[PDB]
Design a protein around this nucleic acid. Sequence first.
DNA 1: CCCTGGAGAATCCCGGTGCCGAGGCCGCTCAATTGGTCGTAGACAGCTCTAGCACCGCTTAAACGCACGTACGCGC
Lengths: 93, 91, 98, 98, 79, 79, 107, 107
Amino acid sequence: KTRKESYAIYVYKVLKQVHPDTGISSKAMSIMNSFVNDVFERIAGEASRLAHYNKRSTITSREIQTAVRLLLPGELAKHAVSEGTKAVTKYTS
Amino acid sequence: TRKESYAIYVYKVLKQVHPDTGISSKAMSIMNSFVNDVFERIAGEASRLAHYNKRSTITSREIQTAVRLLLPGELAKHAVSEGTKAVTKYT
Amino acid sequence: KKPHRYRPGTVALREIRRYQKSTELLIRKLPFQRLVREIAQDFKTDLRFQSSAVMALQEASEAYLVALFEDTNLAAIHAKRVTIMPKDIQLARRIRGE
Amino acid sequence: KPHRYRPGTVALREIRRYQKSTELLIRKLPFQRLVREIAQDFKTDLRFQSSAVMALQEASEAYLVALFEDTNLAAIHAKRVTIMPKDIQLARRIRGER
Amino acid sequence: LRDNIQGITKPAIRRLARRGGVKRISGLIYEETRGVLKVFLENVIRDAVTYTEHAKRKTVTAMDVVYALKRQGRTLYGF
Amino acid sequence: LRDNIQGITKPAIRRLARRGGVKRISGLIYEETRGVLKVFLENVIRDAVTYTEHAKRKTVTAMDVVYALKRQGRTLYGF
Amino acid sequence: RAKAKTRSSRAGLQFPVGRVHRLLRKGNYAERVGAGAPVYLAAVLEYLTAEILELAGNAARDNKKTRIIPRHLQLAVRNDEELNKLLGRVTIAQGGVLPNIQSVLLP
Amino acid sequence: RAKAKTRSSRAGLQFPVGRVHRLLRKGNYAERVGAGAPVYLAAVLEYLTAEILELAGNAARDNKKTRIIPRHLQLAVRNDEELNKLLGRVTIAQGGVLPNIQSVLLP
DNA sequence: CCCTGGAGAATCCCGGTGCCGAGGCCGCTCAATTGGTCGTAGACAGCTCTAGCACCGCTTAAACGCACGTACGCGC
């Protein structure tokens, strides 16, 4: 039928890469999909606002970096910056 | 350069209800900030409303739905009636 | 012969422990569903609600009321009390902004 | 003999005076230098505009005034007229801050 | 449909307070909690009504309930 | 710059509570009020720091503080 | 090129319909914006501006002032119930709060 | 053309970079979306997903459970002080709350 | 009146069933991927000039401190 966009399988590969011995129910899967989706609009909304405040038309890697510093607090942010920085350097290389 | 502001439009609204009262610059900045802040809430809600039903356009109903979602009580109904009267006069 | 006669408070604490670690919905389905329909019928008649739509409303209302009750309970010890009051809720809603 | 105002009369007079006057209660420079030392932990080479400190100061006081209103209401809720640090901690917890 | 505000029974309100760690529950709490729940439901469902009316739909879906809860800072996961 | 948390003096905290309708002020309130003021400032100013860093500027503007307060639901009018 | 008559005058409005339409276009909200969307947005903004100024002028007259000051705007917003809930999460500078005292705090 | 290698493997990630880029373009956020923005977005979402799942697995091991249930996700979010502040205004269905008792409420 | 032994009941650990939701497999198809091509936002370089930073008089209302007692927090 109609293909509905979801992160059901992608959370699963994340789960096995950090814990290859446990499973996850569909109700917990939908919550994780909801959690991923809700954070997605918050960062994109912050990045869209950040570009609008600087009169800039594109959303770059720095836009997401500032967005996750504003939303994620403290030590949770600094690993997200560290994980985000290592992703862009690997992608460019 | 030129800076966008709502200073003059609020002034004409002010005389249309009380022509005997003025306004200050600090009150003007708060009034400019109030209209701008509400503008992003209604447009942001209308942008979200269009995204929910896979709508690529924002119409008067998009603004109308955001009004009853944001404004509580009789304030929303008066705003809906004012917008409906303006829409009929415009069209 | 003598009845057990548990004193007030101890079984309530046991009910706290048995329900804080629990997962099932405390409010019954149909009484909450019927309350939704009569509230919606004041706003719009001939309106229907999906089973998962009522389910989504039920968990959100319970968690909001549970979080309100935690603020209601924490105000009681703040007021040197262990029994919640209707005025305790009114203070909680005012501080929360509601 | 001195007039010797009873405890509460002058405090009420300050309540009437400061709730209609929009003068800025915290002084400018003592609040301004507090911003510089707080922002020094994030950026050593940082500057602040005069309106930037002005915007921070009114927002902080209105948050503190709103917090004091919730703190005061908790005191009467707890059969008291004196605000307490535990009343502040209850206010942040109910509001979801701390 | 009348007198459905009593569907939230006294043990049901009691069980909800037990989840919140409430030691003792007064007899006047249940009437106040029902009024608080009625006010909270009257805001979320009305917001969901405008969401449903905007979609030209006659049945309120769970997705509109999520949007109604999200816009007031009470976002719900799992729908 | 050290010991600037004492810049919020005792009458200054007293004037804040009088605006809030507080009749009696405890002696331990000022230390607690300074703590919640430091925590609140450590969030808004840090948010404005990231706004200023992203804007390619070395001076924090009041405009950046406006979005810093707005994103936490504390929008300020009059800048 | 006929006579240039603003859409605000066509709808009986003072707020700029074209400016509201322009910010909707560059605000990155939606791919398309309708004709009545800025008309409805400006009418709601005009009503909110008129209602706030009406209560601010009434508060200014109560204080024997014929100029609107930020204290009057704060008094106008907080006194009116729907404006108080709508702007509950809104900070107003140079406005203060309502001059109310609790019953048990009175002598 | 060349082999259609995915951008997630090129960036060393599991979350789909192309899906994030497509939703950014169709989500009406900006006129353009940069190349590194979906890569940064995927890394942040993956780390947040990994941190929650690892804490949920620890909570599942605490009550000797193999399958992750929504109670485990709620317990993982509230126990972490970083996740608690991030999801303070977030309601989790079928999760309950933290099983704690006040000190004066104990027998 | 407080300390300690025995027993009633709700809760916790454990063996057996199984079942139904979760884990794994097959297409395959539609959205992710590859290459090229421009309009164009953006990084970079030089000017500047308007506002912030640092120090100085001063004076004066704001603030620290001490003496006293009565509204009030707290114990019972």
